[PDB]
Amino acid sequence: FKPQPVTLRRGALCLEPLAEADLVELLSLAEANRQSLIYMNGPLRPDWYRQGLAEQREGQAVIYAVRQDHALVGTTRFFDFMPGLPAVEIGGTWLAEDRHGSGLNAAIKFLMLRQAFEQWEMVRVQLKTAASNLRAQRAIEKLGARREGQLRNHRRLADGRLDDSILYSITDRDWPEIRRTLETELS
Amino acid sequence: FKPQPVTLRRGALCLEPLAEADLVELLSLAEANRQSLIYMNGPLRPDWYRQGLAEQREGQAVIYAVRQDHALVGTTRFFDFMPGLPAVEIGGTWLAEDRHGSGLNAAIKFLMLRQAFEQWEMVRVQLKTAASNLRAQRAIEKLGARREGQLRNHRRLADGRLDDSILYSITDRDWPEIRRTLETELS
Ligand SMILES: CC(C)(COP(=O)(O)OP(=O)(O)OC[C@H]1O[C@@H](n2cnc3c(N)ncnc32)[C@H](O)[C@@H]1OP(=O)(O)O)[C@@H](O)C(=O)NCCC(=O)NCCS
Ligand SMILES: CC(C)(COP(=O)(O)OP(=O)(O)OC[C@H]1O[C@@H](n2cnc3c(N)ncnc32)[C@H](O)[C@@H]1OP(=O)(O)O)[C@@H](O)C(=O)NCCC(=O)NCCS
C-alpha cells in the first residue's frame, strides 16, 4: 500500500493536491470566512498550508484544494495513514460560508471515501471534530458515520482552551450503505 | 514538556530506557510468552523494538525495558505525543506471564502516570488495547481510566487478524484520584 497524489472529480467539482501555488488564493479566502472557521485554528496563517504541503513530502498526508474550475472554495485532506490495515482519516476540511448548506461537503466526502474504500482498499476511515463544533458534528452524522466516542482534553481551540473531540468511523462493511445514501441526496 | 529519556524506579522494579543491547533478550523473552502476547502486533519481531529506539531520537517515543532488579522482565513505552496540549499515550506494555497479577503493572503504571502528569504537566494520557484483549481491558479499568470507545477495524493481532481497539484516557482532574488509589493500592 502507498498513497500517491490523485485528482478527484465529480461534475462541477474538482479535488486536486495543494500545490504551493495555491496558498495565496487559499489564504485571503479564509480571511473572508473568519467567522465560520473558528473551531480549527490554522486558518489564515498560511504557515498552515505549508505545514499542509510539508506532510506530503514526508508521506504523511495527501492534501487537497476544492474547486469549481476554481474558485477554491475550501480545502480538505486525507491523513493519519495506517497501512497495515489500511485506514485513513479525513479532516482539515473547510469551505467558504457560501458553500455550506449546499451539499458541497457531501460531494467532497463521497469522492474521497469511494477513493479510500474502492481504490485504497481500506477498512476504516476516521473523521474527528471538536466537542463544541456542532455544525461539523451533524455534518459527519448526516454522512452516516458511527460516533465511537469523545476524547476528553484532546484539542485546544483558536483560543488556546481545551476541548474534547468527537470521533467517527466508517468501516469497509459500512461503505455500500454509506455510499448509497450519498448517491441519494446527490439525486 | 520534553520527552527525555528517564529512569523511574520503585523497589525491586526499575524501568530504564531501551537500548539496542536489550533487544536480543527481549525477542527471546517474548517467544517464551508467545501465547500470552497474541493480542499485540510487533512483539516477536526484534525490529518492532528497534523502531521505538529509532523514534527515541525523532522525539516520537520514550521506550522502556522493565526489569526486576536484575532480570529483564518486560517492556512498556510512551508514545503518541501531542505537545500542543500536551498529552501522551502509554502502551507497548507487556510483562512475562509470571508477573501477571503479581502486582508489578500497577507500579509500572503509577510511575509513568506520575511522570506524565506531575513532571510533564500533561492534560491527557490515553491508552488503547484490543477489543479481543480481556485482561488488558480489566487492567486499564483498574487504573481509573474512562472507556472512551470501541474503535472498529482499528488494529491487527499477532495472527494479523483484524480487530477493534478500546480507547481509555485519563485527564488531569482524574489524576489526583488515580494517584491516590495507586497509593491505596500499594498501601
Ligand atoms: C463543516 C464545514 C464543511 C461546513 O460543512 P456543511 O456543508 O455545512 O455540512 P452540511 O451542509 O451537511 O450541514 C451541516 C449540518 O450542520 C447543521 N448545523 C449547522 N449549524 C448548527 C448548529 N449550531 N446546531 C445544530 N446544527 C447545526 C446544519 O443545519 C446542517 O444540518 P441540517 O441539514 O440539519 O440543517 C466547514 O465549513 C467548517 O467550517 N469546519 C469543519 C472542521 C472539521 O471538523 N473538519 C474535519 C471534519 S471532515
Ligand atoms: C498487561 C498484560 C501483561 C496483563 O497483565 P496484568 O497487568 O498483570 O493484569 P493485572 O493483574 O494488572 O490485572 C488483570 C486483572 O484482570 C483479570 N482478568 C479479566 N479478564 C481476564 C481474562 N480473560 N483472563 C485473565 N484475567 C482476566 C485478572 O484476574 C486480573 O485480576 P483482577 O481483575 O481480578 O484483579 C497482558 O495481558 C497483555 O497482553 N497486554 C496487552 C497490552 C496492550 O495492548 N495494552 C497496552 C496498553 S498498556
Numbering used by the authors:
A (entry chain B), B (entry chain A): 2 to 188
Quoted passage from the original study:
GCN5-related N-acetyltransferase (GNAT) toxin, with an acetyltransferase activity-dependent mechanism of translation inhibition, represents a relatively new and expanding family of type II TA toxins. We here describe a group of GNAT-Xre TA modules widely distributed among Pseudomonas species. Notably, other than arresting translation through acetylating aminoacyl-tRNAs, PacT can directly bind to Fur, a key ferric uptake regulator, to attenuate its DNA-binding affinity and thus permit the expression of downstream iron-acquisition-related genes. Previously studies on GNAT-RHH TA family also observed pronounced growth arrest after expression of the GNAT-type toxin and co-expression of its upstream antitoxin gene counteracted the toxic effect.
In addition, both the structures of PacT homologues from P. jinjuensis and P. flexibilis are in complex with AcCoA, and share similar fold with PacT in superposition (mean RMSD 0.28Å). Because GNAT-Xre toxins are widespread in Pseudomonas species, which also have highly conserved Fur proteins, we also tested the binding between GNAT toxins and Fur proteins from P. jinjuensis and P. flexibilis. Consistently, both PacT homologs could specifically bind to the DNA-binding domain of Fur. We also found that PacT homologs from other Pseudomonas species could bind to the Fur protein, suggesting that the direct PacT–Fur interaction is a common mechanism for PacT-type toxins. Based on these results, we conclude that the specific interactions between GNAT-Xre toxins and Fur proteins seem to be a common and novel bidirectional regulatory mechanism, indicating that Fur proteins play vital roles in bacterial iron uptake.
